[PDB]
Amino acid sequence: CPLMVKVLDAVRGSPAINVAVHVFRKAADDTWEPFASGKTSESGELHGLTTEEEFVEGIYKVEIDTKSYWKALGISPFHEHAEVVFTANDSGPRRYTIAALLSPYSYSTTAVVTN
Amino acid sequence: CPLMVKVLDAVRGSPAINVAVHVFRKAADDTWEPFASGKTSESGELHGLTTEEEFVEGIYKVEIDTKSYWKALGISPFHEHAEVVFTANDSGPRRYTIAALLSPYSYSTTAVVTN
Amino acid sequence: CPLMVKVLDAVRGSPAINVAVHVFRKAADDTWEPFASGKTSESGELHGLTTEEEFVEGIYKVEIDTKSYWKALGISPFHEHAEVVFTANDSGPRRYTIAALLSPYSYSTTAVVTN
Amino acid sequence: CPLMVKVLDAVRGSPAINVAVHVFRKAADDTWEPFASGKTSESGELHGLTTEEEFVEGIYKVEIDTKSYWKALGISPFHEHAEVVFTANDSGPRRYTIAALLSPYSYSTTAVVTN
Numbered sequence: 455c456p457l458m459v460k461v462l463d464a465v466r467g468s469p470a471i472n473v474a475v476h477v478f479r480k481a482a483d484d485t486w487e488p489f490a491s492g493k494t495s496e497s498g499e500l501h502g503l504t505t506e507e508e509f510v511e512g513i514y515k516v517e518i519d520t521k522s523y524w525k526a527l528g529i530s531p532f533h534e535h536a537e538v539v540f541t542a543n544d545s546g547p548r549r550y551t552i553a554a555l556l557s558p559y560s561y562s563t564t565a566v567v568t569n
Numbered sequence: 570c571p572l573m574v575k576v577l578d579a580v581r582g583s584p585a586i587n588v589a590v591h592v593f594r595k596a597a598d599d600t601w602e603p604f605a606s607g608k609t610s611e612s613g614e615l616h617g618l619t620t621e622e623e624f625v626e627g628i629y630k631v632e633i634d635t636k637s638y639w640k641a642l643g644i645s646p647f648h649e650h651a652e653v654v655f656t657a658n659d660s661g662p663r664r665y666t667i668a669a670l671l672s673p674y675s676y677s678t679t680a681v682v683t684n
Numbered sequence: 685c686p687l688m689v690k691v692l693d694a695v696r697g698s699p700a701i702n703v704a705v706h707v708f709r710k711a712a713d714d715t716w717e718p719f720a721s722g723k724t725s726e727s728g729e730l731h732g733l734t735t736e737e738e739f740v741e742g743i744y745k746v747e748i749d750t751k752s753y754w755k756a757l758g759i760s761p762f763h764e765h766a767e768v769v770f771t772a773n774d775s776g777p778r779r780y781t782i783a784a785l786l787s788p789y790s791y792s793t794t795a796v797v798t799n
Numbered sequence: 800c801p802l803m804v805k806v807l808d809a810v811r812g813s814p815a816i817n818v819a820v821h822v823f824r825k826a827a828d829d830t831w832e833p834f835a836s837g838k839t840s841e842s843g844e845l846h847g848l849t850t851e852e853e854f855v856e857g858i859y860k861v862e863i864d865t866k867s868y869w870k871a872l873g874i875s876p877f878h879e880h881a882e883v884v885f886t887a888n889d890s891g892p893r894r895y896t897i898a899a900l901l902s903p904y905s906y907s908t909t910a911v912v913t914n
């Protein structure tokens with residue numbers, strides 16, 4: 455609810471389906487601990503990663519396995535994965551949508567933070 | 570239903586609200602005739618532009634008034650507007666979502682064409 | 685060189701070579717009058733479109749023939765072209781670099797404006 | 800120059816000057832070992848990170864300190880940084896240009912890989 459991920463394919467002009475997404479939370483020893491994961495739906499969205507009670511302020515990394523995605527389509531990719539590292543902040547609005555647009559040699563990611 | 574437009578603001582990380590959007594259809598004299606328009610909602614989306622019966626194959630231009638949008642926020646923009654010109658094609662899938670990510674000196678546009 | 689265009693290929697991770705580019709300048713009647721044209725080089729760059737003396741204040745449109753570029757690669761792209769529209773020199777003479785990153789169903793454009 | 804980084808500012812339409820860049824190379828243990836570092840110049844480009852002899856096959860991470868760059872401009876950005884992760888030289892020696900386009904809540908990265 456508080457955190458949603460949406461992936462799109464700029465080569466085929468479609469949602470990016472069954473893309474693996476891992477979210478990590480930065481721990482006090484500065485290592486990344488597993489926090490949430492899932493695979494995008496037919497609409498390229500991944501919902502239900504976390505809840506308001508568990509999504510406390512902190513630094514989060516979301517990993518999008520873009521390489522596996524392009525491999526399964528038979529298209530050489532450049533990147534190992536796409537990356538979005540950010541600070542969740544209770545001051546700001548509290549719904550985070552991380553959207554990624556993927557090409558084999560390029561990606562863009564944007565955050566839409568709303569109520 | 571067949572044609573949807575979604576605009577996002579990469580400076581504020583939010584949907585781009587009350588953005589004017591004009592769609593034109595290319596006529597046989599190669600001029601652009603008015604086809605549909607509206608303003609994006611609070612969620613940055615613009616729905617109900619056209620229907621399946623009216624959205625025939627042809628070349629369409631969609632105009633996003635990005636300049637007015639940045640002006641009202643007090644931010645100098647570079648572009649007069651953002652532009653997406655494309656051929657609607659009955660062979661391909663038939664729902665078109667045109668998404669635009671806006672920055673003052675840059676924009677990206679992507680088409681997601683589904684069932 | 686007051687106006688330079690650089691085009692990259694997001695699918696192949698390379699400059700986009702031999703891409704046709706047409707520039708227009710909006711006249712009184714609000715018709716687009718042919719201004720300058722050329723094709724990108726091996727580096728993806730197009731230099732020599734215009735001169736400081738010829739490139740007066742005005743509203744310019746840079747049309748990048750993205751469709752012919754994807755078609756010669758066997759790809760049926762979404763966009764007919766990428767149009768960049770902007771007011772040039774209106775706060776005085778500037779040097780403009782219009783960069784475009786191309787994918788079959790997506791493109792991004794940015795402007796680097798220096799004094 | 801086998802590795803070059805270029806950073807642009809989508810808000811100001813200018814190169815992103817003085818942006819810190821750190822490169823790591825994944826070791827056996829799957830830890831990221833410091834590889835090279837520097838800051839972009841007035842042109843937004845960072846040259847001289849490494850040499851042909853030093854830049855062997857491996858998995859590299861290029862971290863661009865986008866947050867410090869937006870903060871010195873008075874902007875509180877979404878991302879902690881922009882990380883680019885890729886396998887280099889695995890089909891033989893290449894020259895790599897990693898380009899990033901920055902906005903406060905968004906970034907795009909592309910790779911131009913030449914032989």
Ligand SMILES: COc1cc(C(=O)O)ccc1Oc1ccccc1
Nearest residue numbers: 553554555562666668669670677681
């Ligand atoms: C919500 O976010 C996006 C949503 C959609 C859609 O909801 O079908 C498309 C693109 C979006 O993002 C992007 C637009 C341009 C570049 C990157 C993503």
Ligand SMILES: COc1cc(C(=O)O)ccc1Oc1ccccc1
Nearest residue numbers: 690781783784785796805898899900
């Ligand atoms: C070397 O590559 C780029 C170069 C320039 C420039 O030469 O001034 C601009 C954008 C570049 O890449 C980008 C293109 C679009 C989006 C992001 C970066």
